[PDB]
Design an enzyme around this catalytic site. Structure first.
Site, PDB file in Angstrom:
ATOM      1  N   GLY A  51      90.690  36.938 -50.340  1.00 23.11           N
ATOM      2  CA  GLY A  51      90.687  37.931 -49.276  1.00 23.11           C
ATOM      3  C   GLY A  51      91.873  38.879 -49.297  1.00 23.11           C
ATOM      4  N   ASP A 103      89.053  41.891 -39.654  1.00 23.13           N
ATOM      5  CA  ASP A 103      90.513  41.957 -39.747  1.00 23.13           C
ATOM      6  C   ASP A 103      91.008  43.294 -40.310  1.00 23.13           C
ATOM      7  OD1 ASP A 103      89.230  41.135 -42.113  1.00 23.13           O
ATOM      8  OD2 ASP A 103      91.112  40.413 -42.964  1.00 23.13           O
ATOM      9  N   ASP A 104      92.159  43.744 -39.810  1.00 17.56           N
ATOM     10  CA  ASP A 104      92.805  44.982 -40.259  1.00 17.56           C
ATOM     11  C   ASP A 104      91.947  46.218 -40.010  1.00 17.56           C
ATOM     12  OD1 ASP A 104      94.848  43.362 -41.117  1.00 17.56           O
ATOM     13  OD2 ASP A 104      94.398  43.572 -43.256  1.00 17.56           O
ATOM     14  N   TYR A 142      93.885  37.918 -35.386  1.00 15.67           N
ATOM     15  CA  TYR A 142      93.814  36.701 -36.193  1.00 15.67           C
ATOM     16  C   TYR A 142      95.136  35.934 -36.255  1.00 15.67           C
ATOM     17  CZ  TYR A 142      95.564  40.106 -39.636  1.00 15.67           C
ATOM     18  OH  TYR A 142      96.275  41.092 -40.287  1.00 15.67           O
ATOM     19  N   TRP A 176      93.118  30.257 -42.010  1.00 19.33           N
ATOM     20  CA  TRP A 176      93.288  31.182 -43.124  1.00 19.33           C
ATOM     21  C   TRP A 176      94.784  31.254 -43.409  1.00 19.33           C
ATOM     22  CZ3 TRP A 176      89.982  36.048 -44.277  1.00 19.33           C
ATOM     23  CH2 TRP A 176      90.621  36.879 -45.210  1.00 19.33           C
ATOM     24  N   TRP A 177      95.238  30.537 -44.431  1.00 15.87           N
ATOM     25  CA  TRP A 177      96.668  30.455 -44.704  1.00 15.87           C
ATOM     26  C   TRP A 177      97.065  31.508 -45.727  1.00 15.87           C
ATOM     27  CZ3 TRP A 177      99.970  27.234 -48.360  1.00 15.87           C
ATOM     28  CH2 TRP A 177     101.300  27.234 -47.932  1.00 15.87           C
ATOM     29  N   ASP A 182     100.207  40.413 -52.019  1.00 16.38           N
ATOM     30  CA  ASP A 182      99.798  41.812 -52.089  1.00 16.38           C
ATOM     31  C   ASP A 182     100.701  42.729 -51.261  1.00 16.38           C
ATOM     32  OD1 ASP A 182      99.049  41.158 -49.525  1.00 16.38           O
ATOM     33  OD2 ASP A 182      96.901  41.095 -49.958  1.00 16.38           O
TER      34      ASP A 182
HETATM   35  C1  LIG Z   1      99.942  43.816 -41.677  1.00 21.60           C
HETATM   36  C2  LIG Z   1      98.564  44.081 -42.238  1.00 21.60           C
HETATM   37  C3  LIG Z   1      98.354  43.350 -43.555  1.00 21.60           C
HETATM   38  C4  LIG Z   1      97.842  41.926 -43.367  1.00 21.60           C
HETATM   39  C5  LIG Z   1      96.885  41.594 -44.500  1.00 21.60           C
HETATM   40  N1  LIG Z   1      96.822  40.139 -44.738  1.00 21.60           N
HETATM   41  C6  LIG Z   1      97.273  39.839 -46.106  1.00 21.60           C
HETATM   42  C7  LIG Z   1      98.691  40.333 -46.412  1.00 21.60           C
HETATM   43  O1  LIG Z   1      98.703  41.285 -47.479  1.00 21.60           O
HETATM   44  C8  LIG Z   1      96.137  40.395 -46.964  1.00 21.60           C
HETATM   45  O2  LIG Z   1      96.055  39.754 -48.233  1.00 21.60           O
HETATM   46  C9  LIG Z   1      94.891  40.116 -46.142  1.00 21.60           C
HETATM   47  O3  LIG Z   1      94.087  41.283 -45.974  1.00 21.60           O
HETATM   48  C10 LIG Z   1      95.441  39.613 -44.815  1.00 21.60           C
HETATM   49  C11 LIG Z   1      94.548  39.896 -43.608  1.00 21.60           C
HETATM   50  C12 LIG Z   1      94.515  38.607 -42.832  1.00 21.60           C
HETATM   51  O4  LIG Z   1      95.556  38.140 -42.404  1.00 21.60           O
HETATM   52  N2  LIG Z   1      93.329  38.030 -42.659  1.00 21.60           N
HETATM   53  C13 LIG Z   1      93.192  36.790 -41.925  1.00 21.60           C
END
Ligand SMILES: CCCCCN1[C@H](CO)[C@@H](O)[C@H](O)[C@@H]1CC(=O)NC
EC number: 3.2.1.169
Length: 663
Positions: free
Chosen positions: A132, A239-240, A279, A334-335, A341
């Site tokens: 992910g 997410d995001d 999340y 989700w660890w 990245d």
């Molecule tokens: C601050 C926004 C970025 C958070 C993204 N995190 C990870 C950090 O790179 C990325 O690999 C992944 O998309 C994750 C999103 C996340 O936390 N999902 C449960």
């Protein structure tokens, strides 16, 4: 050393040979995947109604009806026994039988088995990996390798969701995969099934989803297509994202719709999972009530993912208790480790730790989000599998070492050395750090302080650093040429090169400390300068991604030691011989003087971490951020209006905070 370690284990000194003549009982009834493994182990041996009996099957089968009371009554549980008379391989279910064989394969040594009795089962229902991350998704071959790795370590879950897969996320999540990708996904699911892994296909529609019939139907149509490819587990990630897609009510309604009109209608769908927009706790808004809305409205069988108290964090008792209260169910963890990245110039090869070992009943699942380096991530993945199966017996360091020895048996010590000094993330926005080089940290700290103050450092501390640098070179060179795990070596090779250079620089600097005569010191000084330039070169030509380009290694302890030791001894040299040697620790072909921070080159950008002087004339692109001008000779000048101005390919060598230039 069985990994994961079983729940219950009894062994005594008795060696049973893998029988030259065996009698297989239940080969027709048992899990075909488990039988295939057993036959590969028993190949070469003779099969008949003579010799040692080998009973395999699931609870209820004729083959193991005798041992039904020994078989644990848990999902994926199993009973294993070996003695002079009989071998028993009985699972509570088909996946349990498969897992019994994975343990049995570890017990087999030189065709000789220990007299053991095992009752085993997982403490956490779902265990595995979520692809992910942002960045280059895992190659097909990498994924095939991963799935076999999961089977061996009893990980039953793989959640496909590469952020940069256009058919996973916006806008083309609405489109079916092309024939080529579809055929590949089809194979992955088949290979996943052969290794007892649930292939969970995730979709990430939130950024541009409209809450109408058109997008709802397209999502279901996409899910239906994946189902035709063999997918039997599904997920929806929110997410995001920003905008309407963050609406908790609508998210819950959609997942419930999927649940009732698809997941419960199909005869054989297993996992249904969602990742909330909030999340983690720090991103959770208290003024609103996003999480409690999901908890109440979302059907209880649907899993809700969670990364802890922060985006990057370790799971604690108070942490999981906090989320569980709101989502009205055990969180599906989700660890976010070893995902890198957001620190793409670092490899994260350290041990897995920080997660509470007593909270197995408080989580519905536990998956790790890894690096885009698939093989390199197996160190953490192997460890998470151990932790998730038996958290009560989780041995951080032993499992780390076991992982490394499994991944690269032919050069385990070398890989340990490398990973030991490649585990910290360095400074980052999430403030998440890992330990690194703790073995030599105390000797380095004492040596440097004694050296700075002008006191006598300990001979032992000096020799420790010498040994370390020497060992680092051996490891780097042996790893480069290792042909056992070629895909692994391809991933880490740029860092291994940088790793060796760090080691070489370390040796030369210690010699400058030892150095007596002047000309010898100068030889070492010039060599260090050249090594700095070589590290710069690698940093500019390897891993040139848009976000954190380059290659950093041994950043927590070793590089600071060498840099500060080099600066100090040069400082002492200039004092002694009245010289003016440069004590710069990192090579920079450009220059910057002002009314003062180090410059940096990243891709086609030159930046301050005032007047800048490039090593040549380049066409300028822009200057994003006394006056502001540009020049080619440093005599004639040309002003630019900041509107962050553009340069329009104008020749530039001087600038009077980031400058972008053309290649
Ligand atoms: C601050 C926004 C970025 C958070 C993204 N995190 C990870 C950090 O790179 C990325 O690999 C992944 O998309 C994750 C999103 C996340 O936390 N999902 C449960």
């Amino acid at each position: 050393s069985l990994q994961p370690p079983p729940q219950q284990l009894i062994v005594q000194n008795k060696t049973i040979d893998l029988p030259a003549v065996y009698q297989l009982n239940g080969g027709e009834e048992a899990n075909p995947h488990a039988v295939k493994v057993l036959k590969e182990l028993l190949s070469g041996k003779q099969s008949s109604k003579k010799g040692m009996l080998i009973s395999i099957g699931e609870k209820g089968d004729k083959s193991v009806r005798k041992y039904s009371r020994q078989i644990p009554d848990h999902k994926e549980g199993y009973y294993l026994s070996v003695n002079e008379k009989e071998i028993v391989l009985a699972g509570n279910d088909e996946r349990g039988t498969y897992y019994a064989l994975q343990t049995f394969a570890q017990l087999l040594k030189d065709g000789k088995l220990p007299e053991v009795e095992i009752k085993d089962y997982p403490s956490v229902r779902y265990r595995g990996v979520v692809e992910g991350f942002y960045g280059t998704p895992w190659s097909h071959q990498a994924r095939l390798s991963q799935l076999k790795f999961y089977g061996k370590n009893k990980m039953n879950t793989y959640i496909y969701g590469p952020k940069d897969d256009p058919y996973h996320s916006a806008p083309n999540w609405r489109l079916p995969y092309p024939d080529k990708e579809a055929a590949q996904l089809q194979e992955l699911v088949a290979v996943a099934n052969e290794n007892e892994v649930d292939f969970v296909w995730a979709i990430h529609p939130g950024q541009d989803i409209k809450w109408n019939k058109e997008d709802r139907d397209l999502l279901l149509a996409k899910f239906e297509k994946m189902y035709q490819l063999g997918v039997r587990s599904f997920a929806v990630f929110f997410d995001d994202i920003s905008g309407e897609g963050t609406n908790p009510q609508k998210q819950a309604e959609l997942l419930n719709y999927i649940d009732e009109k698809f997941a419960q209608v199909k005869p054989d769908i297993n996992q249904l999972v969602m990742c909330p927009t909030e999340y983690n706790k720090s991103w959770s808004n208290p003024n609103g009530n996003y999480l409690t809305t999901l908890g109440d409205k979302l059907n209880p069988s649907i899993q809700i993912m969670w990364t802890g108290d922060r985006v990057i964090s370790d799971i604690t008792r108070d942490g999981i208790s906090w989320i569980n209260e709101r989502i009205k169910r055990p969180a599906y963890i989700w660890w976010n480790f070893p995902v890198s990245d957001y620190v793409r110039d670092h490899l994260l090869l350290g041990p897995v730790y920080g997660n509470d070992t007593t909270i197995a009943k408080e989580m519905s699942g536990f998956v790790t989000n890894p690096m885009e380096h698939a093989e390199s991530s197996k160190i953490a993945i192997y460890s998470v599998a151990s932790y998730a199966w038996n958290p009560a017996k989780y041995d951080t360091w032993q499992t780390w070492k076991d992982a490394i020895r499994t991944i690269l048996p032919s050069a385990a010590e070398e890989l340990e050395c490398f990973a030991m000094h490649n585990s910290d993330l360095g400074p980052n926005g999430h403030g998440y750090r890992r330990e690194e080089s703790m073995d030599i940290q105390p000797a380095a700290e004492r040596f440097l302080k004694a050296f700075k103050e002008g006191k006598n450092y300990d001979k032992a501390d000096f020799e420790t650093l010498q040994y370390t640098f020497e060992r680092m070179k051996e490891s780097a060179d042996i790893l480069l040429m290792n042909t056992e795990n070629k895909p692994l070596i391809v991933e880490i090779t740029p860092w291994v090169h940088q790793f060796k250079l760090t080691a070489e620089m370390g040796e030369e600097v210690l010699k400058m400390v030892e150095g007596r005569n002047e000309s010898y010191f100068l030889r070492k000084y010039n060599h260090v300068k050249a090594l700095q330039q070589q590290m710069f070169y690698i940093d500019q030509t390897s891993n040139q991604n848009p976000y954190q380009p380059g290659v950093k290694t041994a950043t927590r302890v070793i590089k600071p030691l060498i840099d500060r030791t080099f600066a100090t001894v040069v400082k002492f040299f200039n004092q002694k011989f009245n010289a003016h040697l440069d004590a710069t620790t990192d090579y920079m072909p450009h220059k910057m003087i002002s009314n003062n921070l180090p410059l940096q080159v990243k891709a086609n950008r030159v930046l301050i971490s005032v007047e800048i002087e490039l090593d040549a004339i380049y066409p300028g692109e822009n200057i994003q951020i006394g006056r502001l001008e540009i020049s080619t000779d440093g005599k004639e000048w040309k002003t630019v209006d900041l509107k962050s101005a553009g340069l329009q390919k104008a020749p530039v060598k001087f600038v009077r905070f980031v400058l972008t230039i053309e290649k």
